[PDB]
Write a protein that binds this DNA or RNA. Structure first.
Ligand code: CL
Length: 343
RNA sequence: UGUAGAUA
């Protein structure tokens, strides 16, 4: 029986097993649930660098077999941690040629994310130079999009320009990404971390198909990120459009959240535009909104976010309609969360 | 009364 089967039998019998004992058994240990846990715990608890170094040659020699293994990927990740700096460059060399495949794999992509989280900028750039070859497909991939998001989070903006240029590669790319469950997160991460020179054309593409993106199940989060991370002009354009089309935006499932974001993030003069649209003298828009399955939440958010003077206009506009509003689906509950304002 | 993203 080999070392692993012996060790798996009676762990207590081998309480003094060390990393340097593993030798050629590293691959078998690292792909085993028990063996991988042993390796990880020794790598975390050992005070002996030479013990830790002793399995590194076998990790390198078997890197392609370990990186997308259910248990082996954790062993590889240990050597990208702080404290294993001396091994980072050799380990990147061991995986670099297949990074374009690893980015799409569910275990290997965690190795790549760990590397980008920890290693120095020259090694990050080396990894990204391979991601370059598969970046469009990577952005829409359940696994690859997490590698791309980690890159945007952890690498200086000038070195993710190739990702921004992929968002801008054709007319429809930003739309395609914003309505994709994985691509939309890449767009959001870019809006959070890229420079305003990088985000300006990205935001410009979003504006061109604003209405469609704003009511998309994923795109509405992209638009909320524009409100938060865009320019004052971006918010003015958005608030002007929302105010001019307030009933339509408020009564649709996903775009209703965009109005709420405007009210949470907007300055008083933006809140004034939304309030004025809602109260404009059919019954006032704010009354119609309170009867609606989504817009009633937008009205509640308005009351919670605007100035006392702005609430005063809303109260004076709504109060005559309170009898008939009590009758609608949930209308008793809706006026109940507003009772504090109407007394 | 209303929304989202890969491991033992
Ligand atoms: Cl266009």
């Amino acid at each position: 029986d080999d070392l692993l089967t012996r060790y798996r039998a009676n762990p207590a019998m081998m309480k003094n097993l060390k990393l340097s004992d593993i030798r050629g058994a590293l691959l078998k240990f690292a792909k085993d649930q028990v063996g991988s846990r042993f390796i990880q715990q020794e790598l975390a608890s050992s005070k002996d660098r030479f013990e830790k170094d002793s399995i590194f040659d076998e990790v390198v020699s078997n890197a392609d077999e370990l990186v997308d293994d259910i248990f082996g990927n954790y062993v590889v990740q240990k050597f990208f941690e702080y404290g294993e700096e001396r091994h980072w460059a050799r380990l990147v060399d061991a995986i670099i040629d297949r990074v374009p495949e690893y980015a799409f794999q569910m275990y290997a992509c965690r190795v790549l994310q760990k590397a980008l989280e920890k290693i120095n900028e020259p090694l990050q750039i080396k990894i990204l130079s391979q991601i370059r070859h598969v970046i469009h497909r990577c952005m829409k991939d359940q696994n690859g999009c997490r590698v791309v998001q980690k890159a945007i989070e952890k690498v200086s903006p000038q070195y993710v320009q190739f990702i921004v240029d992929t968002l801008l590669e054709s007319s429809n790319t930003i739309y395609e990404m914003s309505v994709d469950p994985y691509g939309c997160r890449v767009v959001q991460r870019c809006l959070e971390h890229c420079s305003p020179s990088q985000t300006k054309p990205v935001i410009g593409q979003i504006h061109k198909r604003f209405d469609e993106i704003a009511n998309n199940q994923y795109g509405n989060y992209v638009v909320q990120h524009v409100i938060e991370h865009g320019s004052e002009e971006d918010r003015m354009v958005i608030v002007t459009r929302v105010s001019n089309n307030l009933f339509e935006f408020a009564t649709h499932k996903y775009s209703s959240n965009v109005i709420e974001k405007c009210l949470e993030q907007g300055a008083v003069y933006h809140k004034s535009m939304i309030v004025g649209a809602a109260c404009h003298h059919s019954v006032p828009i704010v009354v119609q909104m309170m009867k609606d399955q989504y817009a009633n939440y937008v009205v509640q958010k308005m009351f919670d976010q605007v100035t006392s003077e702005q609430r005063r206009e809303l109260i004076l506009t709504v109060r005559p309609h309170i009898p008939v509003l009590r009758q609608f689906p949930h209308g008793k509950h809706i006026l109940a969360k507003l009772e504090k304002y109407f007394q």
